[PDB]
A paper describes a structure:
This unique specificity of [name] precludes recognition of unprocessed amyloid precursor protein (APP) (hypothesized to be a desirable attribute in a clinical candidate), and is preserved in bapineuzumab (humanized [name], version 2). Here we report that, in contrast, antibody [name], targeting Aβ residues 1–5, binds antigen in a 310 helix. The antigen is bound by antibody such that the amino-terminus of the peptide is buried in a cleft in the antibody binding site, and the carboxy-terminus winds out to the surface of the antibody.
Given the absence of electron density after residue 5 in the Aβ1-40 complex, it is likely that upon binding the amino-terminal epitope, the antibody can interact with different conformations adopted by the Aβ peptide past residue 5.
Numbering used by the authors:
A (entry chain H): 1 to 100, 103 to 132, 140 to 219
B (entry chain P): 1 to 5
C (entry chain L): 1 to 204, 207 to 216
The structure:
């Protein structure tokens, strides 16, 4: 399986620096060119930088040239993007992308970079209790994106709807609902699990009857 | 992609 | 800089029906090596982009045959002959002929189905939030179609517009519906001065209504 796994994203102040990495596996890393491509809130895709297989040649869009440095360590199967003099316009989801067939083929999962002067703050997590029954989790007042929500540590997924975060005053709020059969609740417990990597914090809230 | 060619 | 103009911006098509996306470039994508580096990509909700097509018409491994790419020079098409629910999401063309590589703006494909009313659930503020001075009343509208639904909040019988935050999921490939969350955020001070709280949902038609009394 070709796998590209980005990390190192998060909150950074305007003008400051941040280094992203991408760990590749499932192919001979040193035989492939690699590139970073970013996606904005309007879902526009924008090429950022590319590096050839031997790492000898690097390419940059006019937007980031002179500011970003793409590099790779072949013996570690790792691609890097050293970002400096960051601008608020650099805020986006950054993908690690493999070059093949004359085109880019495999994309990673992406890592989120937020350029902001606001502080990191962990979420407040509030349980929402009520044939089927719907239960909820309100995730309020965190920054930056993302959080990840699961139910029963991922063991419940069929009846789950998680709503994209909405920003208000450099604070995000999101919610998630899960629907289970009402004869199984509350006897079989249901817990929402919220992880916020930026504050390195997780919170678990059991949904308890009111 | 053109840059790799 | 080669401009990739992709149309339409959104497409709504019924399962079993054909879909067609256009992609036009500001310069020919025929390279001097004789090849044409026009690619198509699909990003499904909650997923990373996946290539469908490269070199105009070549299908990626495992892409079904109902996908066909065609075109030359500056005009290109992606055709889906027989739409399935799994096809929903964001389609992008992009060119690898000139530097720098450039992407179309994307086309959002939605599966068209019959209108479905939401299942509505309302939730009073949690006791924990109340302790910190806040009072969000949450309304979940699950599994409806189309996406464009209206939510109305009432407090003691009167519409409340300020302090409402709404958020929609992408389309569910399971049943082709949407869900959305509406949160009315008050202070506890205001919340405790009123008795009845109502959320109402409709597309246009008497609404689906959920209410509680504090
Ligand atoms: Cl360059
Ligand atoms: Cl759990
Ligand atoms: Cl975490
Ligand atoms: Cl962490
Ligand atoms: Cl837990
Ligand atoms: Cl989508
Ligand atoms: Cl309806
Ligand atoms: Cl009311
Ligand atoms: Cl009030
Ligand atoms: Cl009041
Ligand atoms: Cl309705
Ligand atoms: Zn859009
Ligand atoms: Zn941009
Ligand atoms: Zn250059
Ligand atoms: Zn550029
Ligand atoms: Zn340039
Ligand atoms: Zn991350
Ligand atoms: Zn808490
Ligand atoms: Zn647990
Ligand atoms: Zn901001
Ligand atoms: Zn963590
Ligand atoms: Zn935990
Ligand atoms: Zn190469
Ligand atoms: Zn060429
Ligand atoms: Zn989407
Ligand atoms: Zn697919
Ligand atoms: Zn099929
Ligand atoms: Zn050119
Ligand atoms: Zn209708
Ligand atoms: Zn659903
Ligand atoms: Zn009322
Ligand atoms: Zn669903
Ligand atoms: Zn359904
Ligand atoms: Zn009042
Ligand atoms: Zn009404
Ligand atoms: Zn309706
Ligand atoms: Zn009640």
């Amino acid at each position: 399986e070709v796998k590209l796994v980005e990390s190192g994203g998060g909150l950074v102040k305007p003008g400051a620096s941040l280094k992203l990495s991408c760990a590749a596996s499932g192919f001979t890393f040193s035989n492939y060119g690699m590139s970073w491509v970013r996606q904005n809130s309007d879902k526009r895709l924008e090429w950022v930088a590319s590096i050839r297989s031997g790492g000898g040649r690097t390419y940059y869009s006019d937007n980031v040239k002179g500011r970003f440095t793409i590099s790779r360590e072949n013996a570690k199967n790792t691609l890097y993007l050293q970002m400096s003099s960051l601008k608020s316009e650099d805020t986006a989801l950054y993908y690690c992308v493999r070059y093949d067939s004359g085109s880019s083929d495999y994309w990673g999962q992406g890592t989120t970079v937020t350029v902001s002067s606001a502080k990191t703050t962990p979420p407040s997590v509030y349980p929402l209790a009520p044939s089927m029954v719907t239960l909820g989790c309100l995730v309020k007042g965190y920054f930056p994106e993302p959080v990840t929500v699961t139910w029963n540590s991922g063991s419940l997924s069929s009846g789950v709807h998680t709503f994209p975060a909405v920003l208000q005053s450099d604070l995000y709020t999101l919610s998630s609902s899960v629907t289970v059969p009402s004869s199984t609740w509350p006897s079989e417990t249901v817990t929402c699990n919220v992880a916020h990597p930026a504050s390195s914090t997780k919170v678990d809230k059991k949904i308890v009857p009111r | 992609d053109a840059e790799f060619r | 800089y080669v401009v990739m103009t992709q149309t339409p911006l959104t497409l709504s098509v019924t399962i079993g029906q054909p879909a067609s996306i256009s992609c036009k470039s500001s310069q020919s994508l025929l390279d001097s090596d004789g090849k044409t580096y026009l690619n198509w990509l699909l990003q499904r909700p909650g997923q990373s982009p996946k290539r469908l097509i490269y070199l105009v018409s070549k299908l990626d491994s495992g892409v079904p045959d109902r996908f066909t790419g065609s075109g030359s020079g500056t005009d290109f098409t992606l055709k889906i002959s027989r739409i399935e629910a799994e096809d929903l999401g964001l389609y992008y063309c992009w060119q690898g002929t000139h530097f720098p590589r450039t992407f179309g703006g994307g086309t959002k494909l939605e599966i068209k189905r019959a209108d479905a009313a939401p299942t509505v659930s309302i939730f009073p503020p949690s006791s924990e939030q109340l302790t910190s001075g806040g009072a969000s009343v949450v309304c979940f509208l699950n599994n409806f179609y189309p996406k464009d639904i209206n939510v109305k909040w009432k407090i003691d019988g009167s519409e409340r517009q300020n302090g409402v935050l709404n958020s929609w999921t992408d389309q569910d490939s399971k049943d082709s519906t949407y869900s959305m969350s509406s949160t009315l955020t008050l202070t506890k001070d205001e919340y405790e001065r009123h008795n009845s709280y109502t959320c109402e949902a409709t597309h246009k038609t008497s609404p689906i209504v959920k209410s509680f009394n504090r």
